[PDB]
Design a protein around this ligand. Sequence first.
Ligand SMILES: Cc1cc2nc3c(=O)[nH]c(=O)nc-3n(C[C@H](O)[C@H](O)[C@H](O)COP(=O)(O)OP(=O)(O)OC[C@H]3O[C@@H](n4cnc5c(N)ncnc54)[C@H](O)[C@@H]3O)c2cc1C
Ligand SMILES: Cc1cc2nc3c(=O)[nH]c(=O)nc-3n(C[C@H](O)[C@H](O)[C@H](O)COP(=O)(O)OP(=O)(O)OC[C@H]3O[C@@H](n4cnc5c(N)ncnc54)[C@H](O)[C@@H]3O)c2cc1C
Lengths: 258, 258
Amino acid sequence: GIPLTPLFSRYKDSYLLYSFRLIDLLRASKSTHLTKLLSSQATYLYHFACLMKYKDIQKYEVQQLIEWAINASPDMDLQQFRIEFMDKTTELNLRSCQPKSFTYTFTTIWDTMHFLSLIIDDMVYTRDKSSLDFVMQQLKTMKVLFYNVFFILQCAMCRDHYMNVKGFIIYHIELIEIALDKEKYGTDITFVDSYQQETAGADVAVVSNNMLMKNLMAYVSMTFHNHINDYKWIQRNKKPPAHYERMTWGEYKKLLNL
Amino acid sequence: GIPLTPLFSRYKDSYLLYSFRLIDLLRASKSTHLTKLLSSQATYLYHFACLMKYKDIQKYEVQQLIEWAINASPDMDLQQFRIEFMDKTTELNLRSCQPKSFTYTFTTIWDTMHFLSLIIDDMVYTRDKSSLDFVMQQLKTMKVLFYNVFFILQCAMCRDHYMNVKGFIIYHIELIEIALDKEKYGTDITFVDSYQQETAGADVAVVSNNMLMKNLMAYVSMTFHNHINDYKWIQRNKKPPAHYERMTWGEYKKLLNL
Ligand SMILES: Cc1cc2nc3c(=O)[nH]c(=O)nc-3n(C[C@H](O)[C@H](O)[C@H](O)COP(=O)(O)OP(=O)(O)OC[C@H]3O[C@@H](n4cnc5c(N)ncnc54)[C@H](O)[C@@H]3O)c2cc1C
Ligand SMILES: Cc1cc2nc3c(=O)[nH]c(=O)nc-3n(C[C@H](O)[C@H](O)[C@H](O)COP(=O)(O)OP(=O)(O)OC[C@H]3O[C@@H](n4cnc5c(N)ncnc54)[C@H](O)[C@@H]3O)c2cc1C
């Protein structure tokens, strides 16, 4: 139930490009351990792409795609892998998982993280349908995706920094788990409009309060994204550029029609 | 400039007990790598104990204490190490670093984390004195302390969970670094009373706003502590006990006279 907007369309495409570049790494994997980690990450990523598009995951078709990527020739170049990827996904009836744009940049990875955040918010708000158990399983998978992020591009500094602060995101996913658990035991979730209301609601001695900010992960990922960009100037020991600009929640909500 | 209260007194003692138990591990270290990690952690811990007590770190005396612990007999039992520790610290004029209580529990580690949080808040509010550079260095050390936490007691589940969410704490330390950097470049820090005000202040497109919650780390560590205890019921797949009780900011501020 995510609003259709130009930005969300870009997020979807970026997410598919990221997943495509991730499976392209399988044939070049330097170890069984890495192949396993990459294959699992890819399986989960495509699962969420299909959940939104097909309102279900094509566990079978996705597995066939991943199996194909694992066995693809390592001598093959990216252009050839692209071509064979398009043919394979067409054959597997996964045309909706094909990227339209192939320009890979940091925006691609950020877009991917923001896309997953919107999925989390949507799966929770519409939990009326699958089941609290299904959602809980999905959140566990989301934590694995965020605990493990493959940059594909090279940036050791980014990797080290993310290692240090990724817990900020994971912490909020756990807040959702707690809210769902409270609902299982009798207290329905009350959605609020601001992060401030959620913070105030959490400042109690009892567990009978169950307030959760609507669009929480969208806000959390936006805030995290701003933080990384605010901190890079400290990493470079420099004053931020005169035209450095941060994203505001009001602007972000408008862009995604939240 | 931390208020003297019964709770803070307990925090101080717990912090010293934690540090004592950490250096007791040196003589039993299974590798040079571990000895280095433990020695560095211990050096930083004692540095902050002395900073508060002696308004400076006894880099020399602390180094002598650590060197002593590294060379202590591995066959020695904890009671004997205690005795020799008391004699060594007396000799090194570090009597103020001697624990009064020796009962080690999870409370000991939590107290240690809350103590460091109060130190961070105090060093920042009174930055008028050392220098922005000194404080920045201290914060870097604090991040290392929180990125690395030795439980001493055994709890693999705790370790794994902390690994996943410690970024929530580190994220807020980086927020302080950003605030100090903004001050270096011309914008003084404006302290606010609530986390909600800090959140609202951060929701801007410019970098000219520099609002920081007073007692931020005290609030962050309290919130984190509540979160870990809220989540353990999910880990155990059980409803929280009927008498489970959480800490509130109002109660916490009163206990520490913040
Ligand atoms: C997980 C991760 C960690 C990183 N760690 C580091 C690091 O430690 N150091 C470092 O130097 N670089 C790091 N980077 C890269 C850095 O965040 C920027 O992507 C890069 O410097 C390029 O900046 P940019 O000016 O092109 O903007 P980008 O941030 O790349 O912009 C990408 C897109 O996101 C939009 N956008 C900007 N801010 C927000 C927001 N808050 N919420 C939503 N959309 C927004 C932009 O409008 C644009 O369309 C990291 C990237 C990722 C994905
Ligand atoms: C970093 C860390 C991670 C841990 N991870 C796990 C885990 O994943 N799973 C698990 O089962 N256990 C975990 N634990 C242990 C758990 O947090 C408890 O300490 C333990 O279960 C004992 O609970 P208790 O009821 O004795 O209260 P404790 O939380 O141990 O109480 C210690 C003291 O802190 C006070 N206090 C309580 N809440 C707060 C608060 N929010 N702020 C400040 N003071 C407060 C109490 O009043 C008491 O004096 C972890 C401990 C630490 C230090």
